[PDB]
Amino acid sequence: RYQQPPVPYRQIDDCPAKARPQHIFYRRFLGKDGRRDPKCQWKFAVIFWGNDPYGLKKLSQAFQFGGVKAGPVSCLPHPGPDQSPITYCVYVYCQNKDTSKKVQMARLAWEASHPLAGNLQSSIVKFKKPLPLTQ
Amino acid sequence: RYQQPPVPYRQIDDCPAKARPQHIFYRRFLGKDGRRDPKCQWKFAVIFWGNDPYGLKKLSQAFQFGGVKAGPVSCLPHPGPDQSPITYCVYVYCQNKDTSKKVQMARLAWEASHPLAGNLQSSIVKFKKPLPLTQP
Amino acid sequence: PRYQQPPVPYRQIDDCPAKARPQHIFYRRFLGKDGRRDPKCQWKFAVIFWGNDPYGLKKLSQAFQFGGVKAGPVSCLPHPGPDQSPITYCVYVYCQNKDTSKKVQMARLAWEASHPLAGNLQSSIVKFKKPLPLTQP
Amino acid sequence: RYQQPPVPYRQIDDCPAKARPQHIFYRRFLGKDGRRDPKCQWKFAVIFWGNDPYGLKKLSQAFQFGGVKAGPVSCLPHPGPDQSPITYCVYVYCQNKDTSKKVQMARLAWEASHPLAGNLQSSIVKFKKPLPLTQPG
Amino acid sequence: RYQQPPVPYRQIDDCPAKARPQHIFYRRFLGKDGRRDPKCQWKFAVIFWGNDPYGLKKLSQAFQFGGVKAGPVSCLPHPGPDQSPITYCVYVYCQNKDTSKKVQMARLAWEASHPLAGNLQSSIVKFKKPLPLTQ
Amino acid sequence: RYQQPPVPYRQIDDCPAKARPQHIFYRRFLGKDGRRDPKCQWKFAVIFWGNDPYGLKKLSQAFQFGGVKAGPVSCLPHPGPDQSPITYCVYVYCQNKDTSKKVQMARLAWEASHPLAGNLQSSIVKFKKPLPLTQ
Amino acid sequence: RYQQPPVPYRQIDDCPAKARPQHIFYRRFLGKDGRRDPKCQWKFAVIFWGNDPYGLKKLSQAFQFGGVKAGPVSCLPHPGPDQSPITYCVYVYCQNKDTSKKVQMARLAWEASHPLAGNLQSSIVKFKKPLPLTQ
Amino acid sequence: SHPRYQQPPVPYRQIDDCPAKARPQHIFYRRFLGKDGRRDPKCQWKFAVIFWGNDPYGLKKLSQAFQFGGVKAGPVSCLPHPGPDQSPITYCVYVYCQNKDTSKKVQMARLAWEASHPLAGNLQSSIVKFKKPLPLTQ
Amino acid sequence: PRYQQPPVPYRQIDDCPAKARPQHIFYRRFLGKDGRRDPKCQWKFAVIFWGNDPYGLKKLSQAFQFGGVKAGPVSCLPHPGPDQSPITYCVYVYCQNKDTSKKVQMARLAWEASHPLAGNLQSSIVKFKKPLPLTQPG
Amino acid sequence: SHPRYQQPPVPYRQIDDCPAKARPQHIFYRRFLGKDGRRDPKCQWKFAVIFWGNDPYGLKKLSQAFQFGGVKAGPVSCLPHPGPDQSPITYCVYVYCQNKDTSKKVQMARLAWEASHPLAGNLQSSIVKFKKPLPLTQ
Ligand SMILES: [Cl-]
Ligand SMILES: [Cl-]
Ligand SMILES: [Cl-]
Ligand SMILES: [Cl-]
Ligand SMILES: [Cl-]
Ligand SMILES: [Cl-]
Ligand SMILES: [Cl-]
Ligand SMILES: [Cl-]
Ligand SMILES: [Cl-]
Ligand SMILES: [Cl-]
Ligand SMILES: [Cl-]
Ligand SMILES: [Cl-]
Ligand SMILES: [Cl-]
Ligand SMILES: [Cl-]
Ligand SMILES: [Cl-]
Ligand SMILES: [Cl-]
Ligand SMILES: [Cl-]
Ligand SMILES: [Cl-]
Ligand SMILES: [Cl-]
Ligand SMILES: [Cl-]
Ligand SMILES: [Cl-]
Ligand SMILES: [Cl-]
Ligand SMILES: [Cl-]
């Protein structure tokens, strides 16, 4: 009835098909930084936003790892008193600032290599209290 | 799948009636901190989370003001390899840290006065770069 | 009896006078654990509330009665100028830490938000250099 | 029914007679610090406390100046769940920390010079927000 | 014609009569700041100065305590090349900055309660090395 | 009767004879630091003390300059509740800390070239408020 | 006879053909960071190294920008007294440490998008004095 | 080794193996460095000195001269063109070391060679530091 | 042999050259304990005195010979110009701390004030980065 | 020049003026110091390097060599005896200059010379700072 989180996967063939190439690149580029850091807490993310929801879905399905986990496609609120064109967003959660920076670079690399991909705005995010993403 | 953002409000007549009481309380309680301070950028939020999406949807509909704006009901990722019970969440965006604390306090106040309402966990949130929430 | 006396304490919710009781109930729930006394703490904080209606202040005094949050009686600020002008009544709500003090302040703000007939009180956190005699033996 | 603030004075003769010696000494001792200065906000006080309401009342009536102004005799709450003997208090409001320390010293001087006067405890007090003791405007 | 220091007392009966009222006020007002703190060094004072040596003398005789001890009535030198009206001074020696300040306060108090009394100018004084006033 | 301050003098002929030698030395050694400086307040001194009042009187009489001015011979209070043997002192006022150190050194120099004469203990002194010694 | 630097080039057609894909990617991923900053000194680089000189040549030819400039394919010294197999290296010169890190990521990303590319070791480099790369 | 690409200087055991025209410079350095020229096994290869200028032969002799246990020159290389066209080349040689102090002695040593041989070119230079160690270890 | 020698050391006032002995006696008393060696400190300070009269400087040099305060011989500062101009003599008085160095300056200033025939010497405190070899061989 | 006292080294304007046994050292320093060897006319004389050792003749060549517009050695002087008895003399030469950078370069120049010449004495030295400027302008 309501939004639902991306379903997780260990095997690359579980990743939806059209996000698969983005997923693979992310796995190779993130490397060890993609792995759950047992030590740290989940107090970081990167928020990506732009106008195309389908682009963001792929990004959300591509960013699913031990230490890097995206939520579903969401929205920013309308900016003004009235309705305007929607800005969608995905939060890519992770454990430390450095991983969060690498997530940003990762997507920017994907964009660089795919001129037809949306150029997403982004920001590093930090949470005062830890999020419940432990196993 | 694809969410839309809560509709904004002209008059309280435009707030969904199930959230109207929560909304009116927040309007009075936030007072001036609920008004848009164009002097500021949008670099803060509060994230509320819990297991009950209806609770969160009323919260979301309730927090719709000039300087305090909720996103729709959303989700955190599954924490592990397999699927666990869903943790829903709502981000309430605002323009400064003081307001983000007032937002947490508003919700605690509502909860105190309504022992049946869900006791939501939350966290203050800070963004490095400002969000596109300025008025056109 | 020419002098003020301190508010009486409660052994149960129903000992709070009825007109102030709902406000007291909301405070008990909202303050929660922080309403409780911390016998390892000293008393060097308060929130002063002030306004024009002494009966409103009396209910706020009656409502703020807990182990770690205790209102004095309805009192007054001095006149600001050379002649008697409208009275600003005030109540001090004594607390054990700054945190609880801001919570006290928020509690009343919530109360007012949820009850429009309630007076819109002004307030300020207050800090004492020395500990007040509010400890037990 | 409700407490009232001390009446403010235009001339020494308007001061209640029993408090008038204390008022004159404070007027002379405080000197310039007893006057209002328009450069400052009302964010300080001295709280005096003891078991003697009449002694406090003279103190309260004595400290009525442009820049130093006492509240009425009030009470601190009971320390415990049971009533205990009343501790009375007076807040003497000032515009700055130095004036607040001078007020404590003033009263210590008064005690030193009058062995029959009670020995009051006190604390300096700081308010995060300014109190409404300025004139309208 | 050499100056001598004022006489010390043990009893209040030992204070010269004309200085006794001021002495008893100071004894009461200074309280325990008035008494000697043996683990402390004498590196402070209050200098009082004005035009009336008689008022200063009583002040001198008044401030005689374990931790607060006045020297005799003395003088500032002349301010200019020629002789001008004499400015008398008395140093009241203390062991800390707090007591100094209280000494200033003590005498202001005395002045507020006696309009006839001289309104003496004063300064806190600090000595880099300790004075020989330990017993 | 009460103490008076040393008589100021500008010509070395107006200096009391017993102190002329000291004075001539201090005049040359203090050099420019002996001169008054209007852009400075009078918030410093050196206090000299010891058991011999005549020694201190010469010093008092010697240190009379534009920017360096001694009070008369005075005393410190007795250290205890019984009368002790007197410690005398003289304050030499001046405008800055540097000059006060110079004044100290000047007297040590004098002690060094007159080894038979008595030694004085000293301390640099600082006043919170400026003393009334401008013209 | 002596080594020569890579050809600089304005438009992509002047880029050697084999380096053009890597150059385009870099041009897009570096973004503004690829541009010169005349108010910045050349005191950074990334040194890339590996055993395939042809791989290094393409990287060398690809990193030719206003603010990011590669030297030619060079060598590290033999590490021992005997000749062993050669470790080639290319220095990619930059005007700040952030650009350096970005150059490093740019190649990692290239390696993540082409599993056939060699996997170059690399290091940020810091120069005490500025190199003569000013316009 | 690949014929289309630079090779590193041949390393050498006795002084006689140094290329004839480098040898004096080499002997001079060997004396000036003393024991600083030896492999310091407690240290990682994280430093160099870069020498640069416009005469490649001058740099080639320096390159050939600086081959010791703990200081190893790469071959004559180049900086990239500073601008949009080919312009006069600046050649360079990196002389690798294990620590800052050895890197300063290399720099000093060359300064000495120049002050004592006025035909030698006056090479610009800089200390260089690497975040990760280079593969110059045993 | 034919180079400058330091002042001959003497720890008995009568062994001080007679012409410097009054200046010596005054310095010994005025420096007091500051005049003694403190093994705990190192020799990283001095006062340089200079002037055009080498004899006045010679007496100063002879006068300042103490355990913790020790003058070198009368020396010179270089010619300022490309050509020779009238000589500026100097004496370094070595000390173990800054306080003692200022005292040394005050000492000579005192001597000048009490002896108007004495030259007025300019001086400067001096600080050395590294310790001079003035510790006792032990 | 009073014959009882030291005098400053003779200044040059041309290298044939340099005492022959110091000429090698002199030229080497002129080249090593380069620009830093000349008078920096926006600066006062408040630095030096003191060199010391037991061989006065080596120090004398050093004194003679360090003569430039911005680096100027005094004569061979010495330190005081360290103890209350005559012991072996430690000779010293101050090499004056206008800023701390020049003084570090002076120090390095000598060091580079020594590293280059196994027969040269290994002189100890220290940088030196004067609180007031020395009269080396005129
Ligand atoms: Cl960001
Ligand atoms: Cl975890
Ligand atoms: Cl939080
Ligand atoms: Cl109320
Ligand atoms: Cl009440
Ligand atoms: Cl209501
Ligand atoms: Cl407040
Ligand atoms: Cl009244
Ligand atoms: Cl009383
Ligand atoms: Cl207090
Ligand atoms: Cl003062
Ligand atoms: Cl004497
Ligand atoms: Cl002192
Ligand atoms: Cl003046
Ligand atoms: Cl690195
Ligand atoms: Cl540039
Ligand atoms: Cl060459
Ligand atoms: Cl460098
Ligand atoms: Cl002679
Ligand atoms: Cl010795
Ligand atoms: Cl003489
Ligand atoms: Cl100096
Ligand atoms: Cl050094």
Side-chain angles (χ1 to χ4, degrees):
Chain A
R1 204 287 123 90
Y2 285 104
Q3 191 59 273
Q4 229 206 305
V7 24
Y9 42 69
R10 46 146 174 165
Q11 291 179 103
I12 292 178
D13 41 38
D14 297 316
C15 176
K18 256 232 194 68
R20 228 167 229 140
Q22 207 180 148
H23 183 59
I24 283 167
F25 174 73
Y26 292 153
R27 187 185 37 78
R28 293 170 48 82
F29 175 79
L30 285 169
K32 307 174 190 85
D33 297 291
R35 287 165 195 167
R36 191 187 301 266
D37 191 338
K39 303 195 169 168
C40 303
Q41 278 170 312
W42 295 79
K43 304 225 284 201
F44 285 85
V46 180
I47 185 183
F48 292 104
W49 70 90
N51 303 134
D52 170 5
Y54 180 66
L56 279 155
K57 190 187 63 157
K58 291 188 292 182
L59 178 166
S60 168
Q61 295 166 328
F63 281 117
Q64 304 286 330
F65 300 95
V68 177
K69 303 178 186 311
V73 184
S74 188
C75 305
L76 295 185
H78 295 296
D82 319 281
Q83 278 162 304
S84 45
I86 303 170
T87 299
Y88 300 90
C89 59
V90 165
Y91 278 78
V92 183
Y93 297 86
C94 53
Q95 292 169 298
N96 49 57
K97 197 158 193 276
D98 281 343
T99 305
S100 80
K101 295 182 170 302
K102 191 167 208 179
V103 166
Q104 244 166 348
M105 286 293 109
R107 166 73 190 192
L108 203 95
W110 180 261
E111 285 170 17
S113 63
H114 294 89
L116 292 173
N119 176 12
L120 303 178
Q121 280 292 297
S122 77
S123 172
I124 299 295
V125 188
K126 163 94 161 289
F127 303 82
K128 199 179 192 69
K129 293 179 179 179
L131 298 179
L133 291 169
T134 37
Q135 224 189 324
Chain B
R1 44 192 55 277
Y2 295 128
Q3 286 293 28
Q4 291 196 75
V7 150
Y9 308 145
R10 316 246 249 169
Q11 348 169 339
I12 298 239
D13 288 336
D14 306 348
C15 169
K18 292 182 292 297
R20 226 227 313 107
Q22 218 177 146
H23 180 72
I24 281 160
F25 175 71
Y26 293 153
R27 187 177 115 79
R28 292 174 52 79
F29 176 91
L30 293 165
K32 278 179 272 181
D33 305 308
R35 167 104 44 188
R36 177 190 301 269
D37 182 16
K39 185 198 265 186
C40 289
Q41 291 188 117
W42 292 81
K43 269 203 268 212
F44 291 90
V46 176
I47 183 189
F48 297 89
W49 69 88
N51 300 297
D52 169 8
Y54 188 42
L56 289 162
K57 176 155 207 180
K58 291 187 294 195
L59 186 148
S60 171
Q61 295 170 315
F63 282 121
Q64 302 296 331
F65 301 104
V68 171
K69 301 171 198 299
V73 173
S74 194
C75 301
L76 293 180
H78 292 294
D82 311 293
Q83 306 203 35
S84 340
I86 291 170
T87 291
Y88 298 82
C89 62
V90 170
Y91 284 78
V92 184
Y93 298 91
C94 53
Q95 308 174 284
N96 54 66
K97 182 160 155 186
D98 276 353
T99 296
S100 79
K101 284 168 164 301
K102 208 175 188 192
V103 160
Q104 290 182 310
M105 276 283 186
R107 168 66 190 193
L108 282 170
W110 180 262
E111 293 177 6
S113 38
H114 304 70
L116 303 195
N119 272 7
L120 296 171
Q121 288 273 280
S122 71
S123 181
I124 299 273
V125 180
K126 170 63 175 308
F127 307 79
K128 183 151 191 182
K129 272 146 78 193
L131 302 174
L133 288 177
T134 80
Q135 56 196 335
Chain C
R2 24 186 79 154
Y3 306 101
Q4 191 75 88
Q5 293 170 37
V8 309
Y10 313 142
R11 205 190 159 196
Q12 42 156 1
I13 295 157
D14 282 338
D15 297 332
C16 171
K19 286 178 176 174
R21 202 180 291 127
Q23 183 179 177
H24 176 71
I25 285 153
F26 169 73
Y27 295 155
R28 192 182 143 279
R29 291 183 189 288
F30 177 80
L31 287 179
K33 179 88 195 145
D34 302 322
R36 298 174 188 168
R37 174 181 256 275
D38 190 333
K40 288 186 184 176
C41 277
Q42 287 190 310
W43 293 78
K44 311 214 306 185
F45 296 80
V47 179
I48 180 177
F49 290 95
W50 71 87
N52 152 285
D53 178 21
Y55 182 54
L57 279 145
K58 202 185 203 321
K59 290 182 301 178
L60 176 157
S61 178
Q62 290 169 340
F64 279 122
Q65 301 297 331
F66 299 100
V69 176
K70 304 186 185 307
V74 178
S75 182
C76 301
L77 292 184
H79 296 287
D83 245 31
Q84 290 175 282
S85 73
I87 302 164
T88 300
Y89 297 94
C90 67
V91 170
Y92 281 81
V93 185
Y94 297 96
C95 299
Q96 299 181 283
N97 56 61
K98 187 162 186 211
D99 179 83
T100 293
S101 291
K102 296 163 182 309
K103 200 170 188 196
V104 162
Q105 207 168 32
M106 288 301 99
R108 172 65 188 198
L109 192 71
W111 178 254
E112 287 166 23
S114 69
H115 307 255
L117 296 170
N120 272 35
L121 291 181
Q122 306 295 302
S123 70
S124 171
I125 306 297
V126 185
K127 171 63 170 283
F128 303 77
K129 192 156 199 148
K130 293 175 93 189
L132 300 172
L134 291 180
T135 73
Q136 319 186 359
Chain D
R1 181 149 188 70
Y2 301 105
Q3 182 64 267
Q4 239 203 349
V7 190
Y9 316 139
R10 287 187 195 178
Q11 48 173 18
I12 314 258
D13 273 343
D14 310 316
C15 181
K18 297 261 190 148
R20 211 177 267 161
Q22 205 177 157
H23 179 70
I24 286 135
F25 171 73
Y26 294 156
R27 184 170 167 86
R28 295 183 43 82
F29 183 77
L30 297 178
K32 282 167 273 292
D33 298 322
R35 314 179 184 178
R36 195 186 301 257
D37 66 353
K39 313 198 64 172
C40 266
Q41 307 187 271
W42 290 86
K43 301 220 299 198
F44 288 83
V46 180
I47 179 184
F48 289 102
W49 70 87
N51 58 358
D52 180 14
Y54 178 60
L56 281 161
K57 182 167 71 176
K58 302 188 290 176
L59 183 150
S60 168
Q61 297 173 330
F63 280 122
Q64 301 292 325
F65 299 101
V68 171
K69 297 166 189 307
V73 178
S74 181
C75 298
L76 293 177
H78 295 303
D82 307 317
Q83 318 209 44
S84 59
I86 291 174
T87 300
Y88 297 104
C89 65
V90 173
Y91 280 76
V92 181
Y93 301 93
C94 316
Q95 287 179 299
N96 55 56
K97 190 150 120 117
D98 281 339
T99 294
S100 84
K101 284 168 180 301
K102 200 149 191 222
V103 166
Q104 293 180 305
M105 284 290 126
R107 168 64 188 201
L108 269 163
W110 181 265
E111 291 170 21
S113 58
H114 301 77
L116 292 177
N119 293 312
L120 299 175
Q121 288 293 301
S122 72
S123 181
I124 301 309
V125 187
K126 173 77 166 279
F127 301 82
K128 188 182 183 145
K129 296 197 201 125
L131 305 177
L133 301 176
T134 66
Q135 316 227 35
Chain E
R1 325 153 183 82
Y2 292 107
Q3 192 44 273
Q4 290 189 106
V7 185
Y9 355 121
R10 341 184 89 192
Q11 306 179 343
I12 278 172
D13 284 64
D14 290 339
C15 179
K18 298 195 296 295
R20 193 125 38 180
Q22 181 167 182
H23 175 71
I24 277 159
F25 173 73
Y26 297 148
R27 186 196 97 252
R28 292 181 50 88
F29 179 87
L30 294 172
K32 55 200 175 182
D33 282 329
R35 308 183 290 89
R36 185 178 227 119
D37 160 12
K39 302 288 276 193
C40 228
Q41 284 171 309
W42 294 83
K43 313 217 296 182
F44 295 94
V46 177
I47 183 177
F48 290 101
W49 70 86
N51 293 284
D52 165 44
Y54 305 99
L56 284 156
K57 186 163 180 205
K58 278 181 282 176
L59 179 155
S60 188
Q61 298 170 329
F63 281 113
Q64 302 294 331
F65 297 102
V68 172
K69 295 184 195 286
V73 177
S74 178
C75 304
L76 290 186
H78 290 291
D82 302 310
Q83 318 196 28
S84 352
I86 296 184
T87 299
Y88 299 94
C89 57
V90 165
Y91 282 73
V92 187
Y93 296 95
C94 302
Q95 310 171 285
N96 45 73
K97 199 171 181 180
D98 256 37
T99 299
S100 316
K101 297 196 283 270
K102 196 172 211 207
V103 157
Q104 291 182 304
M105 282 293 132
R107 166 74 187 194
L108 270 180
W110 183 262
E111 289 173 18
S113 62
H114 298 84
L116 57 303
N119 302 296
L120 300 173
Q121 293 284 80
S122 86
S123 184
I124 297 301
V125 191
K126 173 75 179 279
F127 302 85
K128 194 202 180 75
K129 264 143 59 186
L131 305 177
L133 296 167
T134 67
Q135 188 57 97
Chain F
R1 180 59 196 171
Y2 289 118
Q3 190 52 54
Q4 268 188 281
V7 183
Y9 53 82
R10 275 156 290 143
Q11 298 185 51
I12 309 177
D13 317 77
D14 298 320
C15 178
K18 64 180 161 279
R20 253 151 193 133
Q22 224 169 139
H23 175 75
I24 290 161
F25 173 76
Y26 298 153
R27 177 183 293 289
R28 293 169 51 72
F29 181 86
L30 291 176
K32 291 186 162 53
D33 318 323
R35 290 166 193 177
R36 180 191 287 272
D37 164 33
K39 60 171 55 144
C40 250
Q41 306 191 105
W42 291 82
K43 303 215 296 175
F44 292 81
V46 179
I47 178 174
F48 291 101
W49 68 89
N51 299 325
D52 162 24
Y54 180 74
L56 277 158
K57 184 168 205 172
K58 297 183 289 196
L59 178 156
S60 182
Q61 284 172 340
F63 274 125
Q64 297 303 327
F65 293 101
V68 174
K69 295 185 182 294
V73 179
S74 180
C75 309
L76 293 182
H78 300 281
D82 295 350
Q83 260 166 336
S84 297
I86 300 174
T87 298
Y88 300 88
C89 59
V90 173
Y91 280 79
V92 186
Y93 305 91
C94 65
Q95 318 193 237
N96 45 74
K97 183 175 201 204
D98 274 349
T99 298
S100 81
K101 286 167 174 284
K102 193 74 171 291
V103 160
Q104 257 194 323
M105 284 289 114
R107 170 64 189 201
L108 277 176
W110 187 263
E111 289 177 0
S113 56
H114 299 78
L116 305 177
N119 300 317
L120 300 176
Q121 290 264 287
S122 79
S123 184
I124 295 299
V125 184
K126 169 75 176 285
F127 304 87
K128 184 158 211 154
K129 295 183 151 213
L131 299 171
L133 299 171
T134 59
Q135 261 160 323
Chain G
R1 245 168 92 281
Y2 288 106
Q3 186 72 276
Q4 290 188 302
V7 307
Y9 49 75
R10 312 164 171 79
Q11 64 190 47
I12 197 178
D13 319 70
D14 296 335
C15 179
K18 201 85 165 49
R20 198 172 295 153
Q22 218 177 132
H23 180 71
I24 294 169
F25 170 70
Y26 294 152
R27 179 186 286 296
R28 288 167 52 70
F29 171 89
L30 289 183
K32 163 194 166 184
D33 311 311
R35 272 164 247 155
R36 184 177 300 260
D37 193 336
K39 214 167 291 177
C40 216
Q41 290 173 306
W42 295 79
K43 289 198 299 206
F44 302 80
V46 179
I47 176 185
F48 296 96
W49 72 87
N51 299 114
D52 177 12
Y54 183 53
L56 283 162
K57 185 177 212 166
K58 292 183 279 158
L59 172 160
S60 173
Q61 290 178 332
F63 277 124
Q64 294 300 315
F65 299 99
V68 161
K69 300 172 184 304
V73 184
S74 192
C75 316
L76 293 174
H78 297 290
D82 314 281
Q83 303 181 28
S84 68
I86 292 169
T87 298
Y88 299 93
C89 61
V90 168
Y91 281 79
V92 184
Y93 298 90
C94 304
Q95 274 165 316
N96 50 66
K97 189 183 177 146
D98 276 21
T99 297
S100 304
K101 280 170 188 300
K102 190 157 209 214
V103 167
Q104 191 163 44
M105 288 306 98
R107 172 74 184 189
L108 251 195
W110 178 265
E111 282 168 22
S113 37
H114 305 74
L116 292 184
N119 293 317
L120 306 174
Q121 302 291 311
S122 89
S123 178
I124 300 315
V125 185
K126 172 72 172 284
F127 300 84
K128 257 199 198 165
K129 248 66 189 178
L131 307 170
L133 297 179
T134 47
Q135 234 286 75
Chain H
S1 109
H2 191 322
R4 308 290 179 248
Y5 295 92
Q6 195 58 273
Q7 298 181 33
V10 186
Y12 46 64
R13 306 164 165 290
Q14 325 105 16
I15 284 201
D16 280 308
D17 300 328
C18 167
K21 291 189 172 75
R23 196 171 299 161
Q25 182 161 193
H26 177 60
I27 286 145
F28 176 107
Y29 291 143
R30 180 180 152 138
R31 160 191 308 293
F32 188 105
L33 276 315
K35 297 188 197 205
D36 282 82
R38 291 171 166 162
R39 178 172 291 278
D40 171 24
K42 174 259 179 179
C43 272
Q44 297 214 106
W45 289 83
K46 290 224 261 190
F47 286 88
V49 185
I50 181 178
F51 288 106
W52 75 86
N54 59 52
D55 161 27
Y57 184 49
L59 282 157
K60 189 182 187 50
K61 283 184 301 181
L62 175 156
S63 173
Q64 275 163 346
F66 272 129
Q67 304 294 332
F68 301 95
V71 350
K72 295 171 174 292
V76 175
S77 190
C78 312
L79 298 180
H81 293 293
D85 290 287
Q86 299 190 357
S87 52
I89 295 167
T90 298
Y91 299 92
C92 61
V93 171
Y94 283 77
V95 171
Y96 303 93
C97 315
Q98 295 165 287
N99 52 65
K100 197 166 187 176
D101 160 80
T102 307
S103 295
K104 286 187 189 302
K105 309 298 112 177
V106 156
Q107 196 172 37
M108 197 192 297
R110 164 66 188 195
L111 228 294
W113 176 263
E114 301 171 6
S116 51
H117 295 75
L119 284 189
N122 301 130
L123 298 177
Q124 290 296 284
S125 73
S126 177
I127 301 317
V128 187
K129 161 73 161 293
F130 306 82
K131 186 157 186 176
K132 304 163 86 155
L134 306 173
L136 291 177
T137 215
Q138 70 193 118
Chain I
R2 52 197 196 269
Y3 294 80
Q4 187 54 71
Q5 303 293 295
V8 62
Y10 59 74
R11 265 182 68 213
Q12 175 176 23
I13 294 184
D14 314 83
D15 295 341
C16 179
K19 300 284 170 36
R21 190 181 286 134
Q23 179 167 188
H24 180 67
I25 289 163
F26 174 77
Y27 291 157
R28 182 173 186 79
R29 303 192 288 236
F30 178 80
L31 280 321
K33 290 164 195 184
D34 282 311
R36 299 161 210 177
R37 177 192 306 275
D38 176 18
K40 307 307 211 311
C41 320
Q42 297 198 286
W43 298 81
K44 309 206 304 161
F45 296 83
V47 174
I48 178 180
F49 292 94
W50 73 84
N52 298 140
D53 177 17
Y55 184 53
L57 277 164
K58 171 61 146 300
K59 285 178 279 173
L60 184 159
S61 168
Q62 287 170 325
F64 279 124
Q65 302 293 323
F66 294 110
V69 170
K70 296 165 185 313
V74 183
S75 185
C76 308
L77 298 177
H79 289 301
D83 300 303
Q84 309 181 40
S85 47
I87 295 172
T88 299
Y89 300 92
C90 63
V91 167
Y92 284 78
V93 182
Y94 303 96
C95 302
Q96 312 182 278
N97 48 70
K98 189 175 195 184
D99 269 20
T100 287
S101 61
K102 282 168 190 184
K103 216 190 190 185
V104 162
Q105 260 181 336
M106 285 292 103
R108 170 73 191 187
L109 260 176
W111 181 264
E112 288 167 12
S114 61
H115 290 83
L117 294 176
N120 295 330
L121 302 176
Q122 303 284 307
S123 68
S124 169
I125 303 297
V126 187
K127 175 74 182 290
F128 300 85
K129 200 114 175 177
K130 274 131 93 186
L132 302 177
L134 293 169
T135 66
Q136 275 211 58
Chain J
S1 311
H2 195 313
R4 185 190 178 181
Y5 301 98
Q6 185 92 80
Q7 84 185 358
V10 301
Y12 324 142
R13 284 186 273 210
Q14 157 180 14
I15 183 180
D16 288 274
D17 304 5
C18 183
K21 269 167 324 185
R23 210 181 273 127
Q25 239 188 294
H26 178 63
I27 297 150
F28 178 98
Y29 301 152
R30 180 174 55 88
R31 301 196 199 286
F32 194 104
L33 293 177
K35 218 179 180 303
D36 296 294
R38 309 174 303 92
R39 167 168 198 102
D40 158 20
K42 190 174 84 168
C43 218
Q44 274 172 327
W45 292 79
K46 288 224 293 174
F47 295 87
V49 175
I50 183 188
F51 287 103
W52 67 89
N54 295 122
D55 168 30
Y57 164 61
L59 278 152
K60 173 71 171 143
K61 288 183 316 191
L62 177 147
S63 175
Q64 280 168 337
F66 276 121
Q67 307 295 330
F68 303 96
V71 169
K72 285 176 186 298
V76 175
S77 190
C78 41
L79 297 185
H81 293 287
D85 303 283
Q86 286 180 46
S87 59
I89 295 165
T90 299
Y91 296 99
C92 63
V93 172
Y94 284 76
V95 183
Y96 296 96
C97 61
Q98 296 131 317
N99 56 71
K100 191 182 186 192
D101 280 331
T102 297
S103 70
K104 293 175 184 278
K105 205 154 176 191
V106 158
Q107 192 170 35
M108 256 177 49
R110 169 75 188 189
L111 208 318
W113 176 265
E114 291 165 17
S116 286
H117 301 69
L119 307 180
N122 309 269
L123 301 172
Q124 292 295 317
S125 82
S126 175
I127 297 308
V128 189
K129 174 78 213 299
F130 303 90
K131 178 173 177 170
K132 295 182 23 211
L134 302 161
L136 289 172
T137 56
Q138 164 170 331

